[PDB]
Amino acid sequence: CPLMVKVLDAVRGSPAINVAVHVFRKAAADTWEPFASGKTSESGELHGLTTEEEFVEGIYKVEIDTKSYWKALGISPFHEHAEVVFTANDSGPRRYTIAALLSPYSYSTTAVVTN
Amino acid sequence: CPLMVKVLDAVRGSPAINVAVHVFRKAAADTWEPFASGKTSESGELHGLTTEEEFVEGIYKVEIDTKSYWKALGISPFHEHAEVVFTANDSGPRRYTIAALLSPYSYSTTAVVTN
Amino acid sequence: CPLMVKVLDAVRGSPAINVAVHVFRKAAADTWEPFASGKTSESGELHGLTTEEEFVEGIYKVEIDTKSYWKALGISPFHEHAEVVFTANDSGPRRYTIAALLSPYSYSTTAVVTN
Amino acid sequence: CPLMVKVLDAVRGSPAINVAVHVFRKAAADTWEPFASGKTSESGELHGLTTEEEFVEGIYKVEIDTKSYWKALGISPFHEHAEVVFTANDSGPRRYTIAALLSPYSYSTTAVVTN
Numbered sequence: 001c002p003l004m005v006k007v008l009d010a011v012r013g014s015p016a017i018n019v020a021v022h023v024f025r026k027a028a029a030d031t032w033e034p035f036a037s038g039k040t041s042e043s044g045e046l047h048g049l050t051t052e053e054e055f056v057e058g059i060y061k062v063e064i065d066t067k068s069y070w071k072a073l074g075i076s077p078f079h080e081h082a083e084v085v086f087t088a089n090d091s092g093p094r095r096y097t098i099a100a101l102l103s104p105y106s107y108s109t110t111a112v113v114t115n
Numbered sequence: 116c117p118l119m120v121k122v123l124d125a126v127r128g129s130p131a132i133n134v135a136v137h138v139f140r141k142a143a144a145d146t147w148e149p150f151a152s153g154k155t156s157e158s159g160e161l162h163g164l165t166t167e168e169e170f171v172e173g174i175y176k177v178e179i180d181t182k183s184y185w186k187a188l189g190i191s192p193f194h195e196h197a198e199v200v201f202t203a204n205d206s207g208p209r210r211y212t213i214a215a216l217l218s219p220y221s222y223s224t225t226a227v228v229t230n
Numbered sequence: 231c232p233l234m235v236k237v238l239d240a241v242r243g244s245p246a247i248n249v250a251v252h253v254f255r256k257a258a259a260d261t262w263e264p265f266a267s268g269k270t271s272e273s274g275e276l277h278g279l280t281t282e283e284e285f286v287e288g289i290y291k292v293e294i295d296t297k298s299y300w301k302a303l304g305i306s307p308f309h310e311h312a313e314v315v316f317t318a319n320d321s322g323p324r325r326y327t328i329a330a331l332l333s334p335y336s337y338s339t340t341a342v343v344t345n
Numbered sequence: 346c347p348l349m350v351k352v353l354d355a356v357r358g359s360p361a362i363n364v365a366v367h368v369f370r371k372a373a374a375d376t377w378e379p380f381a382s383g384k385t386s387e388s389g390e391l392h393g394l395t396t397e398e399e400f401v402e403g404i405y406k407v408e409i410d411t412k413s414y415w416k417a418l419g420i421s422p423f424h425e426h427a428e429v430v431f432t433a434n435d436s437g438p439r440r441y442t443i444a445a446l447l448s449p450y451s452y453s454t455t456a457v458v459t460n
């Protein structure tokens with residue numbers, strides 16, 4: 001599990017459940033190719049997006065669909081989504097956790113990178 | 116204005132208005148002595164807390180009454196208040212802005228220290 | 231000034247100065263069209279991006295060049311940039327401030343929308 | 346495990362290891378009584394602070410010793426510590442995770458409360 005995404009809700013004080021997440025990888029023709037996608041679990045975690053074989057060096061974009069999350073809770077939020085863009089595996093394979101903390105008009109994100 | 120406090124609301128996407136803020140200075144007998152206080156303005160700012168002459172080096176605590184702010188909005192909060200504890204150090208001319216971003220179950224704070 | 235961007239540095243406790251910021255507007259053919267850009271000031275603010283006449287309703291993307299900012303400080307960063315994507319909605323007179331707080335492996339952003 | 350504390354480092358992109366944490370509980374004579382303490386593990390988590398029997402209703406303060414954490418890494422930070430103050434178990438037992446994300450001049454905290 002080299003890429004995991006964890007999403008928390010700062011209004012409710014809970015994991016953000018059923019949040020859609022799309023991962024893209026930058027291609028040779030300077031375009032965002034689809035790479036993996038999933039939804040967060042009851043623990044607000046999304047596991048199994050990729051494998052050590054598939055997750056090669058590259059520039060990745062993790063798009064967290066915060067707007068649909070807030071709209072499903074009957075709230076009109078500010079952002080369309082939260083995007084996290086980074087170079088991965090540049091000095092060999094690493095394990096990445098991308099965490100996001102959400103509020104209707106704000107979000108924070110951090111990365112935990114382990115070898 | 117050597118010390119200013121700015122408070123933002125992450126739920127409404129606005130300044131946090133009429134928030135009570137209490138500042139204390141640590142005294143030699145390990146006790147917190149009231150130093151300054153006020154309510155944030157319509158811009159979520161609290162100016163005029165102290166003067167350069169009164170704001171000496173030492174340990175200060177800024178306590179933001181977040182619970183009353185959320186209750187006045189009819190929103191259920193987690194924290195009793197938000198406390199920011201720091202040391203004021205004289206090292207050339209310095210202005211301290213303590214900023215806080217509030218959500219019901221979370222808060223963030225940063226210091227903007229400038230000449 | 232209907233759109234302002236403010237960027238803070240969580241490592242140095244200061245405004246993030248001379249940060250490049252690019253704003254784009256979403257066009258009918260699902261593409262991002264350049265809209266406005268600039269570099270943050272000594273106060274970490276970028277004023278004068280647009281005018282009330284040019285800033286129509288629509289989806290906007292604010293891309294903050296965080297990687298170049300950290301490299302100029304000799305600090306190793308994680309993100310390629312920070313992107314803030316939102317919808318501008320006309321509902322009475324509104325000013326949008328997009329604020330971001332930067333750290334090498336994390337960032338937070340909030341919207342301050344006022345009359 | 347009704348009370349857990351998780352601490353992340355936003356500069357390194359890692360768990361914040363060996364962070365001291367002290368928990369206090371407000372007493373009848375309006376004083377902060379010591380309740381539990383520990384240090385975060387290699388995963389930046391602190392488990393086993395208390396038991397469901399001991400963790401009764403009350404106002405608790407979780408003090409995270411961020412200053413000693415940054416000083417042990419050879420960095421001079423802004424805050425003395427990060428304090429999280431909240432009422433616990435007011436409507437019966439709950440499980441609380443207090444998470445904190447640290448930078449030298451800033452911190453964020455959130456709570457995950459589950460039944």
Ligand SMILES: O=C(O)c1ccc2nc(-c3cc(Cl)cc(Cl)c3)oc2c1
Nearest residue numbers: 214216223224225329331338339340
């Ligand atoms: O000094 C001012 O005028 C000023 C303005 C905007 C500001 N936005 C913040 C802020 C933003 C985020 Cl995303 C997280 C945190 Cl902790 C703080 O602090 C500000 C200070």
Ligand SMILES: O=C(O)c1ccc2nc(-c3cc(Cl)cc(Cl)c3)oc2c1
Nearest residue numbers: 099108109110444445446453454455
């Ligand atoms: O409980 C866990 O396992 C777990 C994991 C990753 C986590 N990242 C956060 C986090 C992120 C931001 Cl951007 C701000 C703050 Cl305050 C916290 O909390 C986590 C908790």
